Design a protein around this ligand. Structure first.
Ligand SMILES: C[n+]1cn([C@@H]2O[C@H](COP(=O)(O)OP(=O)(O)OP(=O)(O)OC[C@H]3O[C@@H](n4cnc5c(=O)[nH]c(N)nc54)[C@H](O)[C@@H]3O)[C@@H](O)[C@H]2O)c2nc(N)[nH]c(=O)c21
Ligand SMILES: [Cl-]
Lengths: 58, 175
């Protein structure tokens, strides 16, 4: 089985590829604009912090 | 490249609130992904459950399985229902998502997807499984959730058949 525990999944969240836009971003803008967020990649103020999320659990 | 592959392909569905359409027509297929990084890419650029309109749903299901009773993968199936703070809800939803894509369940084939209902009164988070009469699989999945989500004895965890749901609730398993 190809599996991952929460620790590793959270760790990979801080990869650059975890912040770049989805492949279908254009079609997502055309079909469901109301649910989209963080459209400016330059601004990572509201980016998910996996290291903190992991640390918050104890 | 160099992304970490997932065991399965997952599809995020968004149930829009549009009474000009039937319930099935409201189901909007957003996109699919099959690596961990692509999941976070999607997650970082869609609103959490606590920020989207009332009467809408987020559903993550395996590729080629629609989040509905009519799908052949759900016909004989059921769901573990978790009855329900903005932060608490978002994190609980995320933890369920990470259980799914991380393949935390031993009976992986029995996993179909997860649905979060956002309603005014309360908010439901449900995990759908393929065979409701497969008690072994259903219970194993149930235990993994309670353990993973760290659900206290405060909240309940009840399994409901889709057939009993559509007839309007009977819970056949409780944990
Ligand atoms: C999963 N599912 C739902 N529907 C449809 O969505 C309604 C609410 O579901 P729901 O999942 O939101 O249930 P609850 O709010 O917990 O309570 P619950 O007791 O189930 O809700 C009943 C209340 O919901 C209202 N309602 C009816 N249609 C809709 C709808 O399209 N969207 C929403 N948000 N509410 C609806 C209805 O007037 C009543 O007040 C169901 O009643 C089905 O019609 C499905 N239809 C098909 N064909 N296939 C499906 O797999 C399916
Ligand atoms: Cl791992």
């Amino acid at each position: 089985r190809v599996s991952y525990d929460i620790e590793h999944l959270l760790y990979y969240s801080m990869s650059p590829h975890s912040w770049t836009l989805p492949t279908d971003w254009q079609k997502m803008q055309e079909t469901a604009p109301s649910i989209l967020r963080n459209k400016d990649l330059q601004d990572e103020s509201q980016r998910f912090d996996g290291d903190k999320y992991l640390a918050s659990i104890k | 490249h160099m992304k970490h592959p997932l065991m399965n392909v997952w599809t995020l569905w968004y149930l829009e609130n549009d009474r000009s359409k039937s319930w099935e027509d409201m189901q909007n297929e957003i996109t699919s992904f099959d690596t961990v990084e692509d999941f976070w890419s999607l997650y970082n650029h869609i609103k959490p459950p606590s920020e989207i309109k009332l009467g809408s749903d987020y559903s993550l299901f395996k590729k080629n399985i629609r989040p509905m009773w009519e799908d052949a993968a759900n016909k004989q199936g059921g769901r573990w229902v978790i009855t329900l703070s903005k932060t608490d809800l978002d994190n609980l939803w995320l933890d369920v998502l990470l259980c799914l894509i991380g393949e935390a369940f031993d009976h992986s084939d029995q996993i179909c997807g997860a649905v979060i209902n956002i309603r005014g009164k309360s908010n439901k988070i449900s995990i759908w499984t393929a065979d409701g009469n497969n008690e072994e699989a259903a219970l194993e999945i149930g235990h993994k959730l309670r353990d993973a989500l760290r659900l206290g004895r405060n909240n309940s965890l009840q399994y409901q058949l889709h057939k009993d749901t559509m007839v309007k609730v009977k819970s056949i398993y409780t944990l």
